[PDB]
Design a binder for this molecule. Sequence first.
Ligand code: NAI
Ligand code: NAI
Ligand code: NAI
Ligand code: NAI
Lengths: 267, 267, 267, 267
Amino acid sequence: GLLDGKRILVSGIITDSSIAFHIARVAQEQGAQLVLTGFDRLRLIQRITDRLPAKAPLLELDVQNEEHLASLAGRVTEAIGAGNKLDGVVHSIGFMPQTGMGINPFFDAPYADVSKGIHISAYSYASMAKALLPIMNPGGSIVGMDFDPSRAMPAYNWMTVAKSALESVNRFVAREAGKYGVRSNLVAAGPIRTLAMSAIVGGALGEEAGAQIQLLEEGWDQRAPIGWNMKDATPVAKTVCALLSDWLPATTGDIIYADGGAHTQLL
Amino acid sequence: GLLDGKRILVSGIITDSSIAFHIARVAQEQGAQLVLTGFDRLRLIQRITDRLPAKAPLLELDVQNEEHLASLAGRVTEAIGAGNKLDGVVHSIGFMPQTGMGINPFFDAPYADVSKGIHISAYSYASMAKALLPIMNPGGSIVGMDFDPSRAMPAYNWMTVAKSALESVNRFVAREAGKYGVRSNLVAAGPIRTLAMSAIVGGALGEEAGAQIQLLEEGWDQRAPIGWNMKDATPVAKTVCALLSDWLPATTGDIIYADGGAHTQLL
Amino acid sequence: GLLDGKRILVSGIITDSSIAFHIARVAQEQGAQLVLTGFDRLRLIQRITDRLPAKAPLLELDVQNEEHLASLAGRVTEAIGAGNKLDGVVHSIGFMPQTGMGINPFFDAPYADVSKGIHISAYSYASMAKALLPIMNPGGSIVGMDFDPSRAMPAYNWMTVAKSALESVNRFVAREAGKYGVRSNLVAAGPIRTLAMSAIVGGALGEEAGAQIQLLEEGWDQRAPIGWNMKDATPVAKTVCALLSDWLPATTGDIIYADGGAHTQLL
Amino acid sequence: GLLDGKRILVSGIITDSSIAFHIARVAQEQGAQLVLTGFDRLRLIQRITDRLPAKAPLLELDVQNEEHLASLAGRVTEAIGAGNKLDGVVHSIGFMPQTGMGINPFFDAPYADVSKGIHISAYSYASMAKALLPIMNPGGSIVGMDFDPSRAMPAYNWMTVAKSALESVNRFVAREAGKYGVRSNLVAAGPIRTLAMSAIVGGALGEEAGAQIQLLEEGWDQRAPIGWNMKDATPVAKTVCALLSDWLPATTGDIIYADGGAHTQLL
Ligand SMILES: NC(=O)C1=CN([C@@H]2O[C@H](COP(=O)(O)OP(=O)(O)OC[C@H]3O[C@@H](n4cnc5c(N)ncnc54)[C@H](O)[C@@H]3O)[C@@H](O)[C@H]2O)C=CC1
Ligand SMILES: NC(=O)C1=CN([C@@H]2O[C@H](COP(=O)(O)OP(=O)(O)OC[C@H]3O[C@@H](n4cnc5c(N)ncnc54)[C@H](O)[C@@H]3O)[C@@H](O)[C@H]2O)C=CC1
Ligand SMILES: NC(=O)C1=CN([C@@H]2O[C@H](COP(=O)(O)OP(=O)(O)OC[C@H]3O[C@@H](n4cnc5c(N)ncnc54)[C@H](O)[C@@H]3O)[C@@H](O)[C@H]2O)C=CC1
Ligand SMILES: NC(=O)C1=CN([C@@H]2O[C@H](COP(=O)(O)OP(=O)(O)OC[C@H]3O[C@@H](n4cnc5c(N)ncnc54)[C@H](O)[C@@H]3O)[C@@H](O)[C@H]2O)C=CC1
């Protein structure tokens, strides 16, 4: 298995359509031993993760909670056993208040909302690395989830800004992680029909936002030389596993695009 | 003159070595009528700006102050006269708390500090555009100051992250500004020996941070095919004026590099 | 005038819808004294350039002709007067054989064709700089015309490759030009309905190629936050003049996007 | 094994310090069945490849030889057996005449030399894909070797231009390869001390070129958050294997940086 014997923390499972659910599933299929972290609805997440091919301890982690972070590494050490360290960390956490997205005018997002979004979506990549690098093995890998923010787009608004911040954070995290013999990288995924995405497409953030995202999705598959299946998170999970593996050992502070190649094509 | 008859708001003068001081001076040399905005030390800024080739009304603008922003356009209209609108807006505002920079470990910057930095340095580009676009003429130009954050670097830490955010914000601001027939662009300047920069070089944020920035500056001039004079903000002021002019009329959501060409060269 | 007193060589006029025709016209409107170079059909080009606001000596330059290049600087010196040097050079030259474009399969372009295309479209940027830098003044500016090749696109095929090469060449030209106190930059223009473009849209390189380019043009204006008018080369001519001016004095080895901001927007 | 059962053509072995030698070795260690191609010195290459963990048919391929390419797929089919197709293709071919590199002035490289360099180094990526895609399986992977040309650098001169062309070609190859369910990607490696590199460092292309490359190598390891060992091609071979695998299944027309993360860091 690709991740045989590796111990890997996977954050960001909330439903069985979470990208992190698929990351966790593929990692397990590939021999990894997981510790999961979950935000807020731990009973729900436990029930969801019961469906993973293997049992995995689930730890509460609200990335905005200083104490959760301060206790994180001890709790993980408790879960994987004293003397054992993590080989991988998957950050699959993102949030932006509604005012920072969709048809709420870009200018109308109050900074408190944007800040909370950037906190959860960007800064927490650094928070997590800070918490976990002390308990990571040399040759370890931190992976976060990105959505290519190099160009502006409708609807994603301040979440795109948050991702721009995240990409910058990742480069700094790589500098820190390198001290530990650890890589830090993002996977920039194509659009995936998670519950939230489906809700946006269905107009939850305004009809025009829904229409634009639908157009975005369609254009993505069109541009993607190998196509893009927004209903299938597996290619993205595999890519995350690729980075968690020993097979990209010279790649760090970097972004791997698991988007069907859409970003390399204009039309 | 390049900016003859144009009315332009210039934020960010704090000392006579502020990049915005030079932007204001060059703009005036080029025929622009200025409104200045200043943060906090208005008496100081007035005295500094007395040295500009022309008188310019100075308005208080704390970009974190909602009321300042809410009143901004009325105050500007008051200053330039009812029925007159702005042709240009220069955002030359940046701040990051000390914990977000220098030898304070990257991981040790508390999010409240980072957030304040991103507020002033990134989000305020959107705040300013929100406040001023209603009083900007078609063919207008918003320009913000950038420091190329595409690669991580020592010492600049969360300010680089803030600039990554700013670049993303600028692309969204362009979408909004385009509705007004207004361009929005950043000038990514090479390093300029402002007071703060000199202080960092002198070790104000730690000796190693100072040493790294010094190396950064030296490498910049070396890489720059036309050299880079960190003691001369004029080439950057001119570039900002170029964007404020009618001479880059098809450029928006974009970044103009006024850095000696350093970013185009590896070594 | 923006280019008052500057002496500027403008290559690439072939018809009155040549981007270089508009560059030459705007430069003249802005006070520049021009020397034109023309390829092959000098009688035609003379007649076309008779329409420029001012007379300009026209010199033959086949960029693939070593002797033309070897004699170029002497001929220019002859035209502008001994003791006078150029302040600006505009490279607005591009060609790719039909096999390298349109619906001719990408794989089917014979290398001899591609090579000729890269010769005229990329290498000649270096050839021209080699020929002219000895007769350029400090503070001079070389500008070439680019079409953003960072992402692949239908129909443009090997011309996109040629532009990728050109952008790389420009960065090297900047290193050389910097020795002379000369900047070297590209303007990446949006699509302009030159005769050739109109012919491609009309199906000259295959119906599907025509259909794709039409879609490309439509998407460009849609994405452009300030719109894009493919029938108007003036915004691009102005941008070239901006780079020929003293107003981007710290920009070199670089690309200025005169494309309505289209490249900064995904959708 | 990562590449278990996959049939993969590996071009570009010339010595046991060829990056392709290490790609071939790692691929074999990972279960791949190889067909090798070799240029010119087939007796030498056979003797070199005798050292690979497994036997592999060696086929002559001069990428500038139309007949070699025209016969290539039949010869490969002969070697792997009728009814069997390739799963992977590794392009590890590069050449630039001396005049296009080192201290030979950039402007002094005759186009015939540059063209030959671009032919072998860029166009041949398309030639190889053209030859081999008809005999590649869905889910296949074409990988070429890149050296990040996004910024100009000393000494590499027209080879950097060739790599810029190659990166553009790769994006087009992805469009074609996608029709076959095949990915096309580049690995941008850090500098590797191949024989040629060592010769350049030793001054084979001029002392200043040697000095600059040495500085380049040193800076690379310094910038690389996880360091860079130019004497070790394994991390790059592994990265190529990662792309040949099923583990980056949504990545195409893309560049994977196996450079220690050096390109993500300024200083
Ligand atoms: N769905 C899509 O189209 C794409 C999503 N992404 C990114 O993938 C990552 C995963 O999101 P998805 O799986 O799409 O959605 P999701 O909603 O399944 O996952 C987001 C996760 O973030 C967690 N989260 C929110 N606030 C948190 C906090 N304070 N502390 C800890 N965790 C918190 C949520 O509990 C949830 O598990 C995010 O970074 C997202 O931006 C990237 C590209 C595309
Ligand atoms: N000095 C350098 O090397 C470079 C600086 N820059 C950027 O140029 C811009 C101008 O900075 P400099 O002239 O270098 O330094 P500066 O310190 O002269 O200017 C920064 C300005 O930001 C203003 N500011 C801070 N907080 C504010 C708030 N809450 N509201 C309104 N204004 C506030 C300050 O009053 C000051 O006028 C900044 O965006 C900076 O990041 C960009 C590239 C290089
Ligand atoms: N039309 C468009 O949509 C865009 C064009 N460009 C570029 O702008 C530049 C100008 O082209 P356009 O004005 O569009 O077309 P054009 O056909 O008016 O100009 C191309 C010029 O290249 C010259 N040329 C061709 N072979 C030559 C040789 N061996 N020696 C000297 N000159 C030679 C032609 O004589 C012609 O004057 C080209 O680099 C083109 O790629 C860039 C972006 C968009
Ligand atoms: N050594 C380095 O620092 C780096 C090299 N690369 C690239 O890696 C690839 C492999 O080169 P290296 O292993 O470094 O050197 P190498 O000299 O071992 O390999 C180059 C190969 O190109 C082949 N070649 C040359 N002309 C050919 C033709 N007409 N037909 C077929 N093959 C031909 C040579 O026979 C040789 O096998 C090249 O694309 C090179 O640019 C990329 C990054 C760094």
